[PDB]
């Protein structure tokens, strides 16, 4: 047990590229890659990832039959997305060092993950709200803080003013009681419970079994 097994259980590990419900392409453990007929003509012509010609064929197809505004605007969006995915794969391929076709192995996911951890800690140590509590914690409690950062971002975590302070004061059972009252806990109870147990105990016990 170690931090990568922790976030693999909590966050999940995808060996194939996935598109978020909010539109981001991701892979591994939360590794992010890339960020009537009148409106038909308009939006087709404003899709950010089409070619000149790819767009020509759609625009001129609409001219040929304006009735099919529904289908041509459907085609145009398929294409725009097909490209974004292409860009993400490309972004992935530079990261892995081969032509993955949007597929990686676990060790490659772990390699991505380990630098992602490096990014988060850098951020954390630059954040005046998170630094003093993070320096104060031991390695496994730090894993719990990083864990939270992965799920909601530096800023969200940094907004747990009080529980953070209790953590910094080594008041672990106070801290655990306070995290449970949170909106985080209410949105993802099973995960928050494991994280909070990690904060409270300084151990990996919440992940034993499972």
Residue numbers in the entry: 1 to 35, 1219 to 1266, 38 to 164
From the paper:
To test whether EY-CBS detects the formation of a helix, we chose two amino acid residues separated by 11 amino acids in the proposed fusion helix and mutated them to cysteines. In conclusion, we have developed a new method that can convert two pre-existing α-helices into one long extended helix.
To confirm the validity of our EY-CBS method, we designed several fusion proteins containing the protein A domain inserted into loops preceding internal rather than terminal α-helices of T4 lysozyme. Of the three possible insertion sites, we chose the loop containing residue 37 and designed three helix-fusion proteins, 8,155, 8,157 and 8,158 containing the EY-CBS-binding sites. The distance between the Cα atoms of the reacted cysteines is 16.7 angstrom, which is shorter by only 0.1 angstrom than that of 3,311 treated with EY-CBS. The fusion helix thus adopts a nearly ideal α-helical structure and closely matches the intended structure. We also succeeded inserting a protein A domain inside T4 lysozyme with predictable structure. For example, one can insert a helical chaperone protein like cytochrome cb562 into a loop preceding or following an α-helix in the target protein and connect the α-helices of the target and the chaperone protein using EY-CBS as shown in the crystal structure of 8,155.
